[PDB]
Amino acid sequence: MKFNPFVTSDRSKNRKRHFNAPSHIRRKIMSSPLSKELRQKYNVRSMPIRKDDEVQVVRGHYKGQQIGKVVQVYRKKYVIYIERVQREKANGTTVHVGIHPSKVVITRLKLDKDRKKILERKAKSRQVGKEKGK
Amino acid sequence: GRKRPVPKGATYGKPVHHGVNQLKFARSLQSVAEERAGRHCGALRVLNSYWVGEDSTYKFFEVILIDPFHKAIRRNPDTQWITKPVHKHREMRGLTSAGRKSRGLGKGHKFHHTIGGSRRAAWRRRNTLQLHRYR
Amino acid sequence: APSRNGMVLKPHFHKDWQRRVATWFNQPARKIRRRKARQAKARRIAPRPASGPIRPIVRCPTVRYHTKVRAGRGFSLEELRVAGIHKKVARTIGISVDPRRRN
Amino acid sequence: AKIKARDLRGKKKEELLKQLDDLKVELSQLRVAKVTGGAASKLSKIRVVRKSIARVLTVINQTQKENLRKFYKGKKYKPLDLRPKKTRAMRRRLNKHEENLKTKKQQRKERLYPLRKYAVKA
Amino acid sequence: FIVDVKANKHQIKQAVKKLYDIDVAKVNTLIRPDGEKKAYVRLAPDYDALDVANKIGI
Amino acid sequence: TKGTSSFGKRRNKTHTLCRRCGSKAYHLQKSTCGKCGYPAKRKRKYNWSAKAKRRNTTGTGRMRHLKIVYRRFRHGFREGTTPK
Amino acid sequence: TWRRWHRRVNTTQKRYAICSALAASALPALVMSKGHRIEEVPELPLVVEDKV
Amino acid sequence: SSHKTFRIKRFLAKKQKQNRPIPQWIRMKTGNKIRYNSKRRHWRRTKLGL
RNA sequence: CGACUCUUAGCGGUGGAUCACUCGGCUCGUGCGUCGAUGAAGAACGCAGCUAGCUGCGAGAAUUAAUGUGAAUUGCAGGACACAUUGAUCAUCGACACUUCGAACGCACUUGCGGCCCCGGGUUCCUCCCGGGGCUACGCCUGUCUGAGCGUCGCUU
RNA sequence: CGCGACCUCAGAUCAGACGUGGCGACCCGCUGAAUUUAAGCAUAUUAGUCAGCGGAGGAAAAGAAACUAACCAGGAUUCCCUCAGUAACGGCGAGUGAACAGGGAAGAGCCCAGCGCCGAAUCCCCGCCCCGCGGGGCGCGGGACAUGUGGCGUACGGAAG
RNA sequence: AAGGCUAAAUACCGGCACGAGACCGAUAGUCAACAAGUACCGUAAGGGAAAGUUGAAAAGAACUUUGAAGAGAGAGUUCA
RNA sequence: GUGGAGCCGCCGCAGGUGCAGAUCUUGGUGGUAGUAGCAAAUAUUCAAACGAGAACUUUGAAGGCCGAAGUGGAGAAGGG
Ligand SMILES: [Mg+2]
Ligand SMILES: [Mg+2]
Ligand SMILES: [Mg+2]
Ligand SMILES: [Mg+2]
Ligand SMILES: [Mg+2]
Ligand SMILES: [Mg+2]
Ligand SMILES: [Mg+2]
Ligand SMILES: [Zn+2]
């Protein structure tokens, strides 16, 4: 239950802060869980999705053990595009159908200098949660 | 006194408001005299004034004024009260001893028509409907 | 406009009374505000006591009330003079002084 | 060929203006390329040089106003755009010194009769 | 050319002379009703227009 | 002759646009504006129409400078720059 | 907005209703006929010790 | 008029530049709902009034 | 027989009611309570690669610098992916910049007309010769400089 | 006739400052109707409210008694609950209508002119410096203000020697 | 008495930020859920609207055919 | 049967609580009705070309009108 009297609990103001979101908040809210192999090696739960993560889809019409990299992350439409899941048009041109990153599981991160520093900070802040149990 | 500035003495109301020519302007003349002295010099702050002659037509008052930004005024902490920005234009609000005589305030049984704050601050409190929450 | 046996009434609603209405919806919101004006004053001061200085024994005026004892404003000079303490040192002891009171 | 402002600060005044006039020359001949048939590539270049031309003008003005504020530092009567803005009413408050002035009648009232701390049980 | 609307003909006549390194005979301005000032810069007969236009692109 | 033929002579204008509010109310003969009273120093506004305040009060334009004043308020009007 | 939103109840009726609200939470019929499935529970004024 | 001052004709140039249809590439944008310029002024029907 | 008219029902049309949704109100409440000559509020104009509006901006014009963030923006193109350079974007915003009218301020408001001072070149310039820069409103305070008076008076002739 | 002082006044694009306009919910100073009610209407009521005009501020105004009281007396202002729809006003018709005790919220007090006293013991401005950051000074030497009275101790609860 | 300052408790339907509700649900609620003080009207002061909804995702109906085209008849997308 | 995401019973509570009328408000649609009417200032006709298509476009010829206070040739105001 919410106790902080400075953060909302109404329906209409939480939606309005969702669809009018700034694009740096919008990478935070488009996060996806790591795979069960990979969340044990990094002891971190979920990550904001970027451009060349290997990834597979866990619910929807296109799902099931189809590791294949993302290629384009629309923040404005809250949608990643993955290189394999597509759709033929009536014209015959093939287009990417778009799926939301909550319905999607990272199977290989793309590490750079920053994705070390994001994982290490998200992992270090969990041992203090373990140290509280005294 | 003031003549009621109305065309040809026609006030167009009930007969208790035909008062063209016996009207008396409830603020004093010295308060008028300080008011058009501190109006010309809006950079000056006005303290009070006194009487220096009257003829039959004119009445003459010496109005004393204070420059808030001179360093003989902005130092000397017994003078620093007037250079504090609530005292901007004291006579257009009626705050000096010439002008505060016209508000009718003071302690007493003779002056509790203004027994909260000012004259209309009494009237607003006497004429508000103070309905509570559990009533 | 009147009727059978009832009261003859003078409601004073012949004046524009909906503009000057005061509704007390903030009155719990201010009772929890001036509690905080006391608590964050009491710890603000010292071990000096809350609710200010010490007040005198004062008997009320006006025959209806002259049989009782009330807390007054200040002790005053005559009573401060006999007790031995100075008239301007008394208000940093914690003793309020009312110089216009007579004994 | 990118222009970064953290690179430009190590340059001299004679070198910025020669490099400012340069970017005004490419920007003029791309406006010729817009009014003719033009080229797809050329039109795009038009925005990345006019924001590049504001990086040069910013470093000129920031290495002038803060070159000139170190001239008047420690002087009476320094100019109006070098005085702090803060709001109109802030400039007419007294100051952190003259609001501390206490009259000598009220200084000896303080040192003779200070406020004591006390407590009331015993 | 099309010239910024605060520019008179003495300002134009030095501005084509210093950018394009050419002599200007006379200038005739015009406010064309899209709102921008059009200038008809005539050259001195020493110069030519059909090749000065070539070195500025068109 | 009272109506549509007397609408034929409507040919010369009374009001042109004001230099201060852009209104087509700067009267040409009287040389004052209808909405703002241009050559007068104070703005022409009246309590007997709360809409005509609402058309032109503060907050209805760009607020080129009060956006910045209302923004610098919530940090106490800083002057010196950031640390790196 | 000056509708009388709020109501007074004099406090011996507040305490009258709060003795009648506690005394019916000891009768098993009234507390089960309000729907609380209290079949398997032991003794109806349930008291666990103060260690809880 | 053919006798117009500079503040008249830079007012008329502003009214003339803004009387133009929407470009066709905005109807394809994400989340618009403008589909024709509704503020269109025609020189016979609606007049500026100076 | 057919047509016409009428009453019911199906099906199609006209119309946008009902229902379900809601980035909008409205009410109450809490916290702060900040404009302007250092040019406010407002107005006008302009600014995007393709852009009329709303929005955002001011010739540094759909944004500059900085800090935070750390790979997008997206209707289509285009371009730098460089990030153990400086790093896309977005938020913050403390540095810089901020055309014209407006208290509006050289004078007028007709982009009309000046006046001094200095600068770069032309008569190497006074006596009205191009561009640029600075200055020039009213009230009023303290001080300065200049000086009016058969005002009061001194020392004189 | 000249020169010097001082008083009254001028001028300046003088050196350095200031005022203007906006917003106006609340607040302060004035100005101010009528519809309406009285089953008509003039005094009255609406109402010292609407409109008009001027000044502010984060609050404003008020405020340390030329008070309330009439007894065993209270002790600046402001706000609340009462007093009270009461004393009183009024074609005594319609209507209008405060306060003091009392209970609370909050609580805080002070300063000058004058009367005398101290050789004006005082302030502003400029100049170079002690020595400084983010600039303000007590220290130094000049120009003014000022005796037609700056500064100190003092305020009615008394004060001074 | 005819001179002066002074905090707190108090007022706030304007402002900047916030939280909520036995409220209203596109003829309602602000005039205004949207390019609303907007189009438009009046010489001017002033007046001042209409207007929410594809789908989960544009996957917005390629191609054939009749017709000069609108408009069809097939085919196709979609759970529809 | 359509429709495609919420809703209802009982015990108490609370209202912006139920329409046929108000020359009611806003929106929609009929009969009248393929009806009144598309009649001020004398007037058109032949061929051709372009075209999917011509009483109306262009051109050629014929017939006519304005008839120099014009149905001609230029402007102010206004329009933009
Ligand atoms: Mg809400
Ligand atoms: Mg009751
Ligand atoms: Mg509808
Ligand atoms: Mg930047
Ligand atoms: Mg100049
Ligand atoms: Mg003037
Ligand atoms: Mg303020
Ligand atoms: Zn105007």
Per-residue exposure over D83-92, b if at least 16 CB sit within 10 Å of its own CB, e if not: eeeeeeeeee
- C-alpha dist (Å) from residue A75 to A22, A28, A34, A48, D51: 10, 10, 20, 12, 26
- The reply to whether F33 sits in an annotated binding site is yes
Q: F62 burial class (0-12, 13-18, 19+ CB within 10 angstroms)?
A: exposed
Contacts of G1 in chain C (CB under 8 A): 23
Half-sphere exposure for F54 (CA within 13 Å, toward CB)? 4
Residue positions counted in chain F? 84
- Name the experimental technique: cryo-EM
State whether residue D101 sits within 8 Å of chain B by CB: yes
In angstroms, the separation between the Cα of residue C30 and the nearest Cα of chain B is 13
Phi, psi of B46 (to 5 degrees): -110, 135
Q: G4 burial class (0-12, 13-18, 19+ CB within 10 angstroms)?
A: exposed
- A55 contacts A47 by C-beta, under 8 angstroms: no
Pairing of strands A54-57, A104-108: antiparallel
B92 CB less than 7 Å from any atom of strand J: yes
- B43 contacts B67 by C-beta, under 8 angstroms: yes
Whether D98 and B80 lie within 8 Å, measured CB to CB: yes
DSSP 3-state of C92? helix
DSSP 3-state of B95? coil
Least CB-CB distance to D119: which of C48, C88, C89? C48
Q: Kindly give, in sequence order, each residue whose CB lies less than 8 Å from that of residue B130, ignoring residues fewer than 6 positions away.
A: C22
Which residue has 């929807």 as its token pair? A60
C33 CB less than 7 Å from any atom of strand I: yes
Chain F residue whose CA is closest to H11: F17
What the block records as the tokens of G24 is 């019916």
- C-alpha dist (Å) from residue F57 to A67, F20, F26, F44, G25: 60, 14, 20, 12, 63
Question: What is the helix (H) or strand (E) element at residue D49, kind and residue range?
Answer: helix D40-50
- The reply to whether F52 sits in an annotated binding site is no
d(CA G17, CA D6): 77
Residue positions counted in chain H? 50
Q: How far is the CA of B112 from the C1' of I27 (A)?
A: 38
Resolution (A): 3.5
Partners of C70 in beta bridges: C58
Torsion-angle region of residue E26: left (phi > 0), alpha (psi -120 to 50) or beta? beta
List chain J nucleotides near protein: any atom < 7 Å from a Cβ.
16-24, 27-35, 42-81, 85, 95-103, 105-112, 123-127, 132-137, 151-154, 157-158
Ligand 2 centre to CA of G4 (Å) is 11
Partners of E2 in beta bridges: E38
Amino acid code (one letter) for B40 = H
Residue positions counted in chain C? 103
Q: Kindly give, in sequence order, each residue whose CB lies less than 8 Å from that of residue B60, ignoring residues fewer than 6 positions away.
A: B51, B52, B53, B54
Pairing of strands C69-71, C57-59: antiparallel
Torsion-angle region of residue B115: left (phi > 0), alpha (psi -120 to 50) or beta? alpha
Q: In chain E, what is the straight-line distance between the N-terminal and C-terminal CA atoms, in Å?
A: 12
Pairing of strands A94-95, A104-108: unpaired
d(CA C102, CA C91): 19
Half-sphere exposure for E58 (CA within 13 Å, toward CB)? 12
Half-sphere exposure for A39 (CA within 13 Å, toward CB)? 12
C-alpha triplet F26, F27, F31: angle, nearest 5°: 90
d(CA D45, CA A33): 40
Phi, psi of B129 (to 5 degrees): -90, 110
Contacts of H13 in chain E (CB under 8 A): 33-35
